[PDB]
Structure 1
Amino acid sequence: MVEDHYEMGEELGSGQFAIVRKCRQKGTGKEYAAKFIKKRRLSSSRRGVSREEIEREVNILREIRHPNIITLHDIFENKTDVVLILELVSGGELFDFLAEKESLTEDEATQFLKQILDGVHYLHSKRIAHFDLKPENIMLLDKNVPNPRIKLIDFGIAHKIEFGTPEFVAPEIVNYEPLGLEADMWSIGVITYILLSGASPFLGETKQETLTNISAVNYDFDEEYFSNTSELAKDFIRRLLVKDPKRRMTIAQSLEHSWIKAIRRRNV
């Protein structure tokens, strides 16, 4: 059993069918995050996570080796749960960081985005789409520094290309059209808008209104939030928030973009 080898500690987070606890590996003293995923009782049960979601997630994490993506250390399973022993990331979600900061400067935003884009470049090079990129799925190593390091998490709907969270889904998801790596690029555009403004671009009062806004690409650079934003930043976002996935910037193009490079290019 997992608890023979890992002493479980405080609960760090929870969702509908998962709980994550801090734990300590008894043999080494090393601390990890143990994610307990509740299995379906029966193969096609309504409640619980499909065994397919679990195995697919495990297999993707085991194949990835990148500094901006969480590592999987081990796996345990009993009758009711699959327990993933994951790298512990203790600086909280980017979501909570942003909550405290309200909105980021373009320099602060690009420092995060360089890391997010590097991790996504690694995934896309392997033809893996994450499909649930959002600030809640980006963890900080340490929140009390100017340039915090991040790791992508929650690969539960990641797929190899051969419905995530309403505010972040691309139009092709909303309209049941073919999916690819481009959906992740849309989500990066949403993240970028949020980092710079503190506002979610497509959010409506209801989920239905949010989804309607996405499909119509109904957003703006409202002067409330974007009165000081550079034309480069807007170009970056505008080239991601495009309805036709074929027209959207690719991950390589996003990394080459002058906005991302601006901070590297300048001295002061």
Structure 2
Amino acid sequence: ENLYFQSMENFNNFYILTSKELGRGKFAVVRQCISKSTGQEYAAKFLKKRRRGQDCRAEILHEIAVLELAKSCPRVINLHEVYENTSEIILILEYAAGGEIFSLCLPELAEMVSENDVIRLIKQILEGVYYLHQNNIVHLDLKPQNILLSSIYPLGDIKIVDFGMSRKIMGTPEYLAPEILNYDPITTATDMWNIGIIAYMLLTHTSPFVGEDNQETYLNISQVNVDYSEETFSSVSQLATDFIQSLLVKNPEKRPTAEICLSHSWLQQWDFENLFHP
């Protein structure tokens, strides 16, 4: 195989990797790097071309294309450069220093996340997903581990990441929409199901569908058995609840679009610093 992207020699000439490993999966590792010229931080995502027997460069070219297509959306992580060596294609990506919104869903870090912030984070997530769906891209992997923050002290803006599952219109079980369990075709509605889960997790600090075992998880999804008890929802507003209950519905056709969701009353808010005109 001949290499397409810039050489590894250039990569090591222009960047230095740091000791902060940001993530590791079976065929991918992300590490922070720093430009030697400007000192600006990036995330270098190293993706193996060969997986489970399969030459996967084409699939990697597809993900690069999708990131490029979404370059103008500030809600989607920016792709700055690409390099390649014998086994890896390396993505130089915008650094999101706030880490994952999943961190804000753990009972640990949850007396520091107001209602205003959840409303704003969900609004931003919907703007990015609207932009993607307008372009016929369904993300298909919008777990809270895949939405980053530009900062957390203070709370910054959301960056959607990991387009490896992206398509035109069997992962972590608890985040799988029911239509995926039933093999139905890909729909924009699947991302909307996942937006329901993120709202549910930011607001309750619990997983809506996880069970003791995968078997129970799958039954929870296919039956849409979600806890909406007063214990879990005593400090969650009705409008937020309405938002979630409209997205977490079995029939994908009955879920509202991103567009309709952006007009939801839960998210209509006046910034009190501004002068309102009646």
> TM-score, normalised to structure 1's length?
0.91
Residue 66 of structure 2 corresponds to residue 60 of structure 1: yes
1:207 is displaced (CA, Å) by 1.5
**Residue of structure 2 in register with 1:75 after alignment:** 82
Judge conservation of contact 1:38–1:48 (CA < 8 Å) in 2.
no
Determine the C-alpha separation between the residues in 1 that align with 2:43 and 2:193. 29
The correspondence of residues 40-119 of structure 1 with structure 2, limited to 5 A, is: 40=50, 45-46=51-52, 50-64=56-70, 65-99=72-106, 100-102=108-110, 104-119=113-128
Within-5 A mapping of 1:128-139: 128-139=137-148
Shift of 1:245: 0.7
Establish whether residue 159 from structure 1 lines up as the match of residue 167 from structure 2: yes
Please, which of 2, 15, 18 is the counterpart of residue 28 of structure 2? 18
Partner AA of 2:139 in structure 1: H
Query: Shift of residue 3 of structure 1?
Result: 1.7
Cα separation, 1, equivalents of 2:261 and 2:144: 18
Matched length? 261
Unaligned runs of 5+ in 1: none
Task: Decide whether the 8 Å contact of 1:129 with 1:184 is kept in 2.
Answer: yes
Distance in 2 between the 1:48 and 1:203 partners? Answer: 32
TM-score by length of 2: 0.88
- Structure 2 unaligned spans of 5+: 1-7, 274-278
What is the CA-CA distance between 1:23 and the residue it aligns to? Answer: 1.0
CA RMSD of aligned residues (A): 2.0
Instruction: Tell me how far apart the structure 2 counterparts of residues 169 and 264 of structure 1 sit (CA, whole Å).
Output: 35
Match of residue 176 from structure 1: 183
- The offset of 1:98, in angstroms, is 3.0
3-state SS of the aligned residue for 2:156? coil
The superposition leaves residues 114-145 of structure 1 with CA deviations (integer Å, 9 ceiling, x where unpaired) of: 11111111111101111111211111111111
Which amino acid in structure 2 is aligned with residue 118 of structure 1? E
How many Å apart are 1:50 and its aligned residue? 2.7
Q: Secondary structure at the match of 2:42?
A: strand
- Tell whether the 8 Å contact from 2:29 to 2:47 is kept in structure 1 after alignment: yes
Cα offsets for 1:36-95 (capped at 9, x unmatched): 01221xxxx516783343111111001112111100011111111110010111111111
Is the partner of 1:129 in helix, strand or coil? coil
Equivalent position amino acid for 1:160 in 2: K
Alpha-carbon spacing, 1:82–1:256, altered in 2? closer, same or farther (3 Å): same
- Pick one of 187, 193, 204 that aligns with 2:211: 204
Query: Which residue identity does 1:159 align to in structure 2?
Result: R
Q: Give the fraction of aligned pairs with identical amino acids, expressed as a percent.
A: 48
